[PDB]
Amino acid sequence: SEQLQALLLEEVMNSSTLSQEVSDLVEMIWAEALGHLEHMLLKPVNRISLNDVSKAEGILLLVKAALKNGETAEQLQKMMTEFYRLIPHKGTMPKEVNLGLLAKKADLCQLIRDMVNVCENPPSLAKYRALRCKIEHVEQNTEEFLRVRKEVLQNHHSKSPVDVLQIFRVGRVNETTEFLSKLGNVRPLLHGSPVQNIVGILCRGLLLPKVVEVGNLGSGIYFSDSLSTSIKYSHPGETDGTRLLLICDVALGKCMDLHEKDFSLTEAPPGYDSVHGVSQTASVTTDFEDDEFVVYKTNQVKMKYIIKFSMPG
Ligand SMILES: Nc1ncnc2c1ncn2[C@@H]1O[C@H](C(=O)N2CCN(CC(=O)Nc3cccc4c3CNC4=O)CC2)[C@@H](O)[C@H]1O
């Protein structure tokens, strides 16, 4: 019948037995992300609507505007208690509402939006599609795995053993086409990050830090040629106990070598496309302990791989 042939097509169209490795990765990063929310949310995430988040974000803008104008804390707290009604927290309710809090509350709202959107087609594929990002497992047999393994395990100043469990080929669609390859000097660098950030990184790529009216080369996207340095930023997840790390092609064209720190950099110096923090050496002292590479454009970045690894300790 019409209906049978519909079901038979439905079976075909709705089928993708994508690998365990990729599935387990998706399940983890989402679980780890949800683990962050559950840590500081009285109300379950399922019982928060998208309206609550939109209104919550709307209040932060009013509170931020009011804070800069120097309104009394009476008004600020009155507005903020309305925010906390929509987005309940456990622990403290900061009396001193600084600008730094509002930025983190704004981040939190986005992490809530992720978890709400995804809830909806098995529960594994719903989470994969939600990333809008094409992860593909690379087999240990292939010569691509040995290649990438060595690429990661080259600049290792520290001699701490590294258990490279899984490697995944990753790509975002719009990230590739908008990449500034024409601007030369593209080299593959590493970006460490805690596991709870990964869903957000895969969803929206690496974003520019928000200049609050912390990094020692200003508000840009940092990378390193060394693995030992990227391990420091790639913290172990509470879910699995493993570390995740990105390999990105960073188009950084003209790269100015710096010795002194500079926290006020919103974009690259005039004349250069990027910055290199030169590390402390034998007879060349610097303020940088490790080699930092910083770009201040999202379209100077293009992530290639995700590396799942773990330290002994
Ligand atoms: N879309 C996104 N969703 C969620 N988190 C996202 C994101 N885009 C970036 N991030 C995350 O924001 C964080 C961020 O901006 N930060 C925190 C880190 N800080 C200093 C810094 O980058 N230092 C630094 C220096 C040298 C190497 C490396 C790093 C970090 N990773 C490295 O390999 C600069 C500001 C960062 O940890 C990144 O992973």
Author numbering: 242 to 361, 368 to 460, 469 to 568
Please quote the paper that reports this structure.
The PARP4 catalytic domain was crystallized on its own, and in complex with the NAD+-mimic EB47 (32). The CAT/EB47 complex crystals diffracted to 2.95 Å and belong to space group P212121 with two molecules in the asymmetric unit. The refined structure has a crystallographic R/RFREE of 0.215/0.262. While building the model for the HD using the CAT/EB47 diffraction data, it was clear that the HD occupied a significantly different position relative to the ART than that observed with PARP1/2/3. In contrast to PARP1, the PARP4 HD is translated and rotated away from the ART active site, located in a position that does not appear to be an impediment to NAD+ binding. A notable difference between the PARP1 and PARP4 structures is that two helices αA and αB of PARP1 are merged into one continuous helix in PARP4 (referred to as αA/B in PARP4). The presence of the continuous helix αA/B in PARP4 is likely to hold the HD at a specific distance from the ART, essentially maintaining the catalytic region in an open state. The analogous residues in PARP4 (V286 and I289) remain in the interior of the HD fold, suggesting that PARP4 is held in an open and active conformation without requiring the major unfolding event observed in PARP1. The PARP4 catalytic domain crystal structure represents an ‘open’ conformation that is capable of binding substrate NAD+, based on the complex with the NAD+-mimic EB47 and the binding analysis with the non-hydrolyzable NAD+ analog BAD. Our analysis indicates that PARP4 achieves the ‘open’ conformation while maintaining the core fold of the HD.
